[PDB]
Every structure is written in structure tokens, then in C-alpha cells.
Design an enzyme around this catalytic site. Structure first.
Site, PDB file in Angstrom:
ATOM      1  N   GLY C  67       0.226  -0.970   0.072  1.00 44.90           N
ATOM      2  CA  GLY C  67       0.102   0.208   0.529  1.00 44.90           C
ATOM      3  C   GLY C  67       1.000   0.982   0.331  1.00 44.90           C
ATOM      4  O   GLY C  67       1.880   1.369  -0.931  1.00 44.90           O
ATOM      5  N   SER C  96       5.628  -5.869  -0.198  1.00 38.18           N
ATOM      6  CA  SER C  96       7.122  -4.925   0.129  1.00 38.18           C
ATOM      7  C   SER C  96       7.034  -3.869   1.316  1.00 38.18           C
ATOM      8  O   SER C  96       7.464  -3.993   2.126  1.00 38.18           O
ATOM      9  CB  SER C  96       7.126  -3.924  -1.242  1.00 38.18           C
ATOM     10  OG  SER C  96       5.359  -3.152  -1.275  1.00 38.18           O
ATOM     11  N   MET C  97       5.489  -3.619   1.677  1.00 43.81           N
ATOM     12  CA  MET C  97       5.513  -2.329   2.503  1.00 43.81           C
ATOM     13  C   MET C  97       5.220  -3.822   4.476  1.00 43.81           C
ATOM     14  O   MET C  97       5.576  -3.554   4.993  1.00 43.81           O
ATOM     15  CB  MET C  97       4.199  -1.609   3.023  1.00 43.81           C
ATOM     16  CG  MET C  97       3.920  -0.803   1.455  1.00 43.81           C
ATOM     17  SD  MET C  97       5.429   0.317   1.552  1.00 43.81           S
ATOM     18  CE  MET C  97       5.704   1.019   3.235  1.00 43.81           C
ATOM     19  N   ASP C 170      11.306  -8.241  -8.378  1.00 43.65           N
ATOM     20  CA  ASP C 170      10.150  -8.836  -7.501  1.00 43.65           C
ATOM     21  C   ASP C 170      10.852 -10.230  -7.525  1.00 43.65           C
ATOM     22  O   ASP C 170      11.135 -10.921  -8.348  1.00 43.65           O
ATOM     23  CB  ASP C 170       8.690  -9.374  -8.246  1.00 43.65           C
ATOM     24  CG  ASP C 170       7.635  -7.801  -8.407  1.00 43.65           C
ATOM     25  OD1 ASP C 170       7.726  -7.128  -7.538  1.00 43.65           O
ATOM     26  OD2 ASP C 170       7.124  -7.889  -9.400  1.00 43.65           O
TER      27      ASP C 170
END
Ligand SMILES: Nc1ncnc2c1ncn2[C@@H]1O[C@H](COP(=O)(O)OP(=O)(O)OP(=O)(O)O)[C@@H](O)[C@H]1O
Ligand SMILES: Nc1ncnc2c1ncn2[C@@H]1O[C@H](COP(=O)(O)OP(=O)(O)OP(=O)(O)O)[C@@H](O)[C@H]1O
Ligand SMILES: [Mg+2]
Ligand SMILES: [Mg+2]
Lengths: 331, 191, 191, 353
Positions: C67, C96-97, C170
Site C-alpha cells: 500500500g 513490500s510494505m 520482484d
């Protein structure tokens, strides 16, 4: 009965009490009227006036007893200081309520002449608060009405001035409820977080209703047309009191050091700081005792250890709690 | 969903939402775009806390990408009018109104988390109409731009010529850079 | 629908929702896309648990596809700021977050389920404007990318050059692979 | 006889107590100046000699009662230890508030004057503390009722304590004994006051810039009375006016590492030595290796029960040994080690043959 003018009463009493002159003004005229009026009523037109009982409400170490004593210091008539806890049921569970009249018999010298003008005073009346309790209040209220009752020696109960004073716990909170709060706006006067925290909520303005809410018998609460208001203390009055008594705290401290042969030299500057410490602990005039007693502990454990300690100089740093007693030991 | 919390006061147990419980401790949250409805809630919260304790400080957390200028001014003007000192703590982003409300806190009470990002840009406006109407609205948006720059200069101490130069374009400032600039006073790292 | 639950404490019976009942046990849930509104709730919960017990260990389950970067920083900075150790237990996925918060947990208290997936990626941002604005925004996102790499390097212990290299594209990692990488400490299999 | 200085009295207290210097000097200074009052009876404007009654407070096992026990054996004036729990309001059936004064007379041969010179210590003062800060609707006669009843004596009064005989007479010429001369030292363990002062000092808020503190912890007991003020006493339940009557407030640090390592052997009466003395009668020696002592010291800390806990530790370790030695003769000594205390090892038994 001494019966001086209000001016003389206040002025002569000011000599021994500093800071309580506001309440004095009221009590001065109050007692003045009572003696004069009753003694020489001369069948006044439409007599309605009841005994001018004055209430006394002040916290602990407020000088209630001191004002009671100074009031009774020059009063030739008896004062018969008594207590409200000592009273119990009427000779059923313990002490009877006639013991207040028994204390009057001792002070009046068994003289009916003195008995009729007896200023029956009580202290710590707030310890019989209803929750014995309420029973003692009613048995006490009976005598307040002025009902002649022997202890055995007949005693005149009419015209007995009541200056009873109690250190009511939780009095300010009750009168704080009566006080209104501020609004919530852009053009409104929020006056404070709380209202009975800046001035003594109790001893600025009181009405009989507030006393009934406290949990006291309404008849006794509405039995005194006059009231009083004792100021806890004053910063200016705290420096004068430090050395005003004959055996004042500071004086006695030096006298105790003098028993060993040491002088307790003290600085004027230190005095100001000392007053603040007492004002923060909020324990009254008696409270100041603890502050210096601890401060002197080091000096009460240094002067004995080192002999020939001529004097001891106390500076503002010592009361701040950083400096150590400046021993003046020499030859 | 908003979770429930129990205070367990001496008088008895009470149930308050997570936001209401923090409001009891004089904490106000500013989240999302600034608009009239959400801004009115902050104003109401500020006034209510003032009556409860006009001496205790208030903490205003600011996480917003900006919004309406008018709504923001109602909050800023309210913070200064009230007696208590409204602290400010950046919790990650303040683009246009967040920095005006972060720099409009009492001196010595403006904080920012270690990785927060603060920006400052001139107020954006949109209007359509006749040439006469455009000239009238143009003066209004130019007047607002000056009043906003004056506020930053007062709280930051920097001269107006520097503020206007820095607000022409988007300027990002980190926690350390903001302290030197004057937007904030201290950067909270650990307890 | 959220099911209700009864505690049956000594004091009496109080009904709590399934989420609030677990909040009393120092547990916070992070589900869905990270945003300012949901992230602010986590901050409020973390602060509340701190006051309740500043010595106990908090647990934060993370199941989210990522997000807002600013929202994540508010949580990460909050966890490191407070004194209590914030344990992490990745369930499902952690993008990621989500991975940054997982790596940001207290040392030795980072966990993941056997079939959990953890992916680390670079910040994804978008902006439109003139060349001058693009140059300013490009520097900002590049700055954030460097700070995030330093954070992962600090917790994981890997050098910065490896983090930037592995975050370019990724890269999915399983529980066992994460332990060797340094993102976590132990993989919970069974009680 | 020669009005011993504070140092001349503390010397004896130091023989047994280990680390209570704050309290030992408070009593020393008070006792020192108190003696002067008896001699300073001259009417030279030096008669008031007001007394600031001390209120000794602190955690359990801090040698509070101990002080009175040792001070009772030093003071030349009749010293009587008291308790605030048994004496109850005269009105209600039970013991009377004045009986404690009679206790002093018993050890003073009823010499009222000499009795007046004596001191009156009252341990366990935390009991009388009001049920709540504000009085309850049900009278706490076994509590604040007694508090006020004794208060007047503290201020100063006279007590009509009866003599040893003369029952025939209706009031048997009840002996009048002054109270202003009888100093008062109030002892007691104020369990729960730590939380009171903890909140009074700071009420943990919420936020990054708040004063968040541990909700509920028993780790701050150590030096938890060094910030206590009369306000906090009131919250505990000590009636405000009663608090004022006692201006001085002593503080007793929970314990220290050095005191626990030292107390096992250092004091005159030492737990270790107590068992060793008993072991001697049995016919065995109790050699406590230095490491052994430090081990027990640590063990006492977890109990959080005060110095008393030490006794339990040694008794647990020396249980099989004390149960075996009688039936298991030929034991010359029983060496002790740190491992034995920890529990991993069993007390080393020595044999002369
Ligand atoms: N108004 C005052 N002026 C001078 N000294 C005062 C005053 N009030 C109290 N004191 C000091 O307090 C000490 C005596 O306290 P006292 O026993 O009179 O308390 P109290 O006021 O009677 O308590 P209460 O109000 O509960 O009856 C004296 O040392 C005296 O110096
Ligand atoms: N500082 C100390 N030095 C030596 N012995 C101590 C010390 N403190 C406690 N003790 C030991 O503890 C016992 C006395 O306990 P203590 O008087 O400390 O309890 P207390 O604090 O009075 O309890 P309470 O407050 O409930 O009356 C004695 O056997 C004594 O040997
Ligand atoms: Mg008095
Ligand atoms: Mg004891």
C-alpha cells in the site's frame, strides 16, 4: 463580660493572631451584639432575635484554637472548651452529653452569675458527622436550643454563645458541586479546570443549604444565623510567625543548640524559601515544623560530632537542599 | 472496523472506541484530506478539551496530503485562540495544510517522527467564469498566498522572501532539514 | 459479519467483538491494502497497548499486499519508538510494505507460517507534471528507496548493495529462505 | 546520664541493623534532643520544647520493629512497644485506649512522673488507616475511630490510669499521668502506598511525548517512600489532621545487595550462627563457605518477603541434613557451598574418620 467595641475586639485580638483579621471583623461585631443585646434587651419591640451563634469552619492548623484562645484570653466570662468526639449516647454506651455543661461548671467556678454568660465553645465538631454519629448531634442540638439542664448543679443554658469550630473534611467538595462550571465556546468564559482549587471554596461564601448537604442535621445547620471563614495561611504571615511566638520554632531551634553551647545563626534570605516549602506541603503552620526538623537533622548530627562548634550559619542554598551546614567551628 | 476499549475506571467499567479513549488524554487525530466536515470535528474537539482543562497541553497528530484552505484556517485560528498549547507531531506526511498546522503549534512542542516527510507549496485553486470574475478571484488567491507565507515566517522566523521562493515549487524536507528551516523544534527518535 | 465474544472475567460478563477481545492480549491485525485510515488505527492500538503495559511484548500479524509508503512509515517508526518489543508473525502474504514491518519487528520475535510468502519490491509511485516537477519528485522517490534499503539492511544484516540488487525486481521467498536472508528468525510449524 | 550524642546511640543500633542509617539517625537525633527536654525544665522561656512525632514507615523486613527492640534495650527511660490493632474505643466493648499507658506504668512501677519521661512506639499503624480516603457509611471503630481517640493524647492530655489495687474504692484514685512529655514514634508497613505515590507523582498518559509508566508493578518498592508527602498519606486513609500531628516522616529503603550479603553473618544474631549454635549442641559444625552466603542473598530477593525470607531459604536447604545428623552420627562437619544453596548439589557432609 468584657464586651468591648468591635474595633477594640479586633485590634486587641490582632496582637496575637496575624492573617485571620477578615473573619475577626465579622466575629467581632457578632459577639459584641450578643452580650449587649441579650443583657439589656429592655423588652425590645417584636423580639424575634435568637442567640447570635457564630459558626467556625477552618482546616487543620488554621489557628481555630488560637482564635478560640485569644478570644478567651481576655474574656473574663468562662469559655469551657470541649470536644465533640468525647460525647456519646446519654450514659448508655459511654460519656453523656451533659459533660459539656460539666466543663462549664469547672470554668464558671460554680457561679450561676458566670454560668449564664458562659461562651460554650467546641472544637472538631466535624467528627460526629452522620454516616456515636447522628445520635450525638441530636442530643447535642438539644442544649443548643437553650434547654436548662443540670449535670449536680443547675446551669443557665439561655444566652449561651456558641462559637463551635470543626475542621470539616470534604467541605469544599460539597460547595464545589453548588458552583457552576464554564461553557465550551469561542466567546465563553471557561474559568478553570476546577473551581475550589484557587481559593478555599468553603471559606469564601457559605449558605445553610451547603451544610445540610454535607450530612449534618438540618435543624442544627440552620441554628446559627452568623458564620465565619478562616484563611488557611498567608506567605507574608508565615515569616512573621516564624519568630512571633514566645518559643517560636526558630527560637526553640536556637535554644536547643544553645543547650550544648552553639549559636543557631540564621539568615533573613533563608526565611523566604522556608515559607514556600510549607506552602507546597499544604499542612498549615504546624507543617513548617517538619521541613526545618529534617533540614536541621544534618545540623543535629554535625554539631554534636564536632565539639567547640561556636555557631552555624544557614544560607538560602541550605534550604534549597544543595549546600551543607557552614560549620563556623573555631578555637 | 474500529476496535473497542475498556477504561476500567474506579467508579466502574466503561467502553470507549479507540479514538474516543485517546481523546480523553487530550489527543486529536487529523487523517485524510482536509474538508469542512472533518475539520469541524477537530474544532469541536479542541474546544471541548479546553473546557475540561484549559491549562493542560493538547497533542494534534497530523497525517494529511492537504485540502481546503478555509477548513484549515478554522483549525489554525482555533489553535491560537484557545489558551492551552496545542502540540503537533507529524506521523508521516503533511503536504500543504499539514505543515501549516504542524508549524502553527506552540513553540517547543512541534515534533516529527524519524522518517516523516513534509512539503510546502502554494495554494491551488480552480475557477471559471468571465474575465471580471477571474480578476476578482485571482486577487483573492493572491491575497491568501501572502497571508499563508506570513504565518510560516512568524512561526519559523525565516524572512518572507525565502518562504515565497520555497513555495513556488514543491519542496520536500526531511526531519533534520525541517529543524534547521524552523518548521519544527525536535525530532522524536526513541522514548 | 463480526462475531461477538464474552470474556467471563471475575468482575462479570462483558461482550467484546472478536477483534477487540484479542486486542486485550496485545494483538493487532494488519489486513488489506495499507492506507492512512487503517494504518492510523494500528498506531492508536500500539500507543494504547504501550500505556497498558510498557513491559509486555506486543504481537502484530501481517497479511497485506502492500500500500501507501507514508502509511507504512508511520507504523514502522511507531514500533521502533515505543519501548515494548513488537513481535511479528506473517500469515498469508507480505509484500513490500508488509515485509518492511515484518523485518522491523524485535530481534528474535519475527515469525512466519510454513506456507507464507514474503516479497520485497521497490517503491511504486506515479506523478504527472512539468519537467521541473518530475525532477523534484524523482529525487524524492529515489531518497525513500535508499532509506528503505537501509532499514532492511539494518534488521536483516545484509549489505546495502545486496538489498538494492534484490529489490530491483520482484523476489519471492519462503519461510526457510527468509531465515537465511535475515528477514525473520524462526518459522513456526506446530505447537 | 550524660545526654548521649546521636553518634553515641547509633553505635549500638549499628550492632544489629544493617543499612537503616536514615532511620537510625532520625531516632538518634530525636532521642538526643528529647533527653534535653527532661533536663531543660527551667522556666527560662525554654519550656515549650514541642515534639515532632516521627512516623516510621517502609517495606516489610526493613528492621522497623527491630529498631524498637534494640532501642528498648538502650534508652534509660522506660520504653514500651505498642500495637494499634488491639486497643479499641472504650465505648465499644473491648480493650481501652488508655491500657497502653498502663503498660508503661507496669515497667515503670507506676511512677507517673518517671512514666511521663518514657517513650511510646506504635508499630502496625497501616491497619488503623481509613477503609477508603473518604469515611465509609459504617463506622470504622476498629480504625479511624481509634485514630481520633488517641490523637488528643498525641496533642497532649492527661490519663486517669488506675493503680495496682484498691478495687474497693469506687474510682480508686485514678492516677493522673501527663502525655505531652511522652514522645510518640509511629511505626508501620504501608502496603499499597507505593501505588498511591506512583500515581500522585505522575499519572501515566498516552502519546509519544507522554509520561507512560508501568500500570501495576511491585519492582519500585525499593526507596518507594522517599517522595511520600502528607497528601499521599490522606489518600491511603490517614486522616489529614492526624497526619499534621506527626510532622516528621522517616523512610526505609527496601534493602541493598551489601546488606543481604552482610546480614547472614555480620549482625550479632545471625541466622547462619543460630543454626550453627543449635548444631553445636547436636555435636556438629556448620561451615558456611563465603559463596554460600551470596547465593542465599540472591534467593531472598525473589520471595520479596523481606529479610525474614532468608530464614526460609536456609531451613529448606538444611532440612535433610537436620533430619539425618541425629540418625546419621559420625558427622564431624557439614560444609556448604553455593551449588548446595542453588539446589543443584546436596550439602557436603564431613566425617572425622
Ligand atoms: N493563625 C496562626 N497564627 C500563628 N500561629 C499559628 C496559627 N495557626 C496555627 N499556628 C501554629 O500552629 C501551632 C498550634 O496548632 P494547633 O494545635 O492550634 O492547630 P489547630 O489550628 O488548633 O488545628 P484545628 O484547626 O484542627 O483545631 C502553633 O505552633 C502555632 O504557631
Ligand atoms: N535491617 C535489618 N537488619 C537486621 N535484621 C533485620 C533487618 N530487617 C529485618 N530484620 C529481621 O527481621 C525481623 C524483624 O522484622 P521487621 O521488624 O523488619 O518487620 P516489620 O517491618 O516490623 O513488619 P511490620 O511492618 O509488619 O511490623 C528480625 O528477626 C530481624 O532479624
Ligand atoms: Mg490547636
Ligand atoms: Mg515487624
Amino acid at each position: 463580660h468584657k464586651l468591648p467595641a468591635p474595633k477594640e475586639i479586633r485590634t486587641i485580638l490582632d496582637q496575637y493572631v496575624i492573617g485571620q483579621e477578615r473573619a475577626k471583623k465579622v466575629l467581632a461585631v457578632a459577639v459584641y451584639n450578643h452580650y449587649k443585646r441579650l443583657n439589656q434587651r429592655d423588652k425590645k419591640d417584636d423580639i424575634e432575635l435568637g442567640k447570635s451563634n457564630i459558626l467556625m469552619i477552618g482546616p487543620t492548623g488554621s489557628g481555630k484554637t488560637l482564635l478560640a484562645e485569644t478570644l478567651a484570653r481576655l474574656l473574663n466570662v468562662p469559655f469551657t472548651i470541649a470536644d465533640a468526639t468525647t460525647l456519646t449516647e446519654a450514659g448508655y454506651v459511654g460519656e453523656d452529653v451533659e459533660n459539656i455543661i460539666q466543663k462549664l461548671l469547672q470554668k464558671c467556678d460554680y457561679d450561676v452569675e458566670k454560668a449564664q454568660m458562659g461562651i460554650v465553645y467546641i472544637d472538631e465538631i466535624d467528627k460526629i458527622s452522620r454516616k456515636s454519629g447522628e445520635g450525638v448531634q441530636q442530643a447535642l442540638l438539644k442544649l443548643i436550643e437553650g434547654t436548662v439542664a443540670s449535670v449536680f448543679l443547675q446551669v443557665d443554658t439561655r444566652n449561651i454563645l456558641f462559637i463551635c469550630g470543626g475542621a470539616f473534611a470534604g467541605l469544599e467538595r460539597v460547595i464545589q458541586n453548588r458552583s457552576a462550571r464554564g461553557g465550551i465556546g469561542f466567546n465563553a468564559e471557561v474559568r478553570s479546570q476546577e473551581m475550589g482549587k484557587k481559593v478555599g471554596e468553603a471559606f469564601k461564601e457559605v449558605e445553610p443549604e451547603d451544610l445540610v448537604k454535607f450530612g449534618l442535621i438540618p435543624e442544627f445547620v440552620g441554628r446559627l444565623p452568623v458564620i465565619a471563614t478562616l484563611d488557611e495561611l498567608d506567605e507574608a504571615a508565615l515569616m512573621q510567625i516564624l519568630t512571633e511566638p514566645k518559643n517560636a520554632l526558630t527560637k526553640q531551634y536556637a535554644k536547643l543548640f544553645e543547650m550544648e553551647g552553639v549559636d543557631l545563626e540564621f539568615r533573613p534570605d533563608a526565611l523566604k524559601a522556608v515559607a514556600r516549602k510549607a506552602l507546597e506541603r499544604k499542612t498549615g503552620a504546624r507543617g513548617l515544623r517538619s521541613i526545618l526538623e529534617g533540614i536541621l537533622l544534618d545540623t543535629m548530627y554535625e554539631i554534636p560530632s564536632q565539639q567547640d562548634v561556636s555557631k552555624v550559619v544557614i544560607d538560602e542554598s541550605v534550604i534549597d537542599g544543595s549546600s551543607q551546614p557552614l560549620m563556623i567551628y573555631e578555637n | 472496523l474500529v476496535p473497542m476499549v475498556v477504561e476500567q475506571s474506579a467508579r466502574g467499567e466503561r467502553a470507549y472506541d479507540i479514538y474516543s479513549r485517546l481523546l480523553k488524554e487530550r489527543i486529536i487525530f487529523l487523517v485524510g484530506q482536509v474538508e469542512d466536515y472533518m475539520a469541524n470535528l477537530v474544532v469541536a474537539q479542541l474546544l471541548f478539551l479546553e473546557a475540561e482543562n484549559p491549562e493542560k497541553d493538547i497533542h494534534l497528530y497530523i497525517n494529511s496530503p492537504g485540502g481546503s484552505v478555509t477548513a484549515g484556517m478554522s483549525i489554525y485560528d482555533t489553535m491560537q485562540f484557545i489558551k492551552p498549547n496545542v502540540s503537533t507531531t507529524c506521523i508521516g506526511q503533511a503536504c500543504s495544510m499539514g505543515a501549516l498546522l504542524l508549524a502553527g503549534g506552540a513553540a517547543g512542542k512541534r515534533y516529527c517522527l524519524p522518517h516523516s516527510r513534509m512539503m510546502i507549496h502554494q495554494p491551488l485553486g480552480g475557477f471559471q467564469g468571465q474575465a471580471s470574475d477571474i480578476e476578482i478571484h485571482a486577487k483573492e488567491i493572491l491575497f491568501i498566498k501572502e497571508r499563508l507565507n506570513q504565518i510560516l515566517a512568524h512561526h519559523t522566523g525565516q524572512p518572507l522572501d525565502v518562504i515565497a521562493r520555497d513555495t513556488d515549487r514543491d519542496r520536500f524536507m526531511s526531519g533534520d532539514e525541517a529543524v534547521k528551516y524552523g518548521l519544527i523544534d525536535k525530532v522524536m527518535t526513541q522514548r
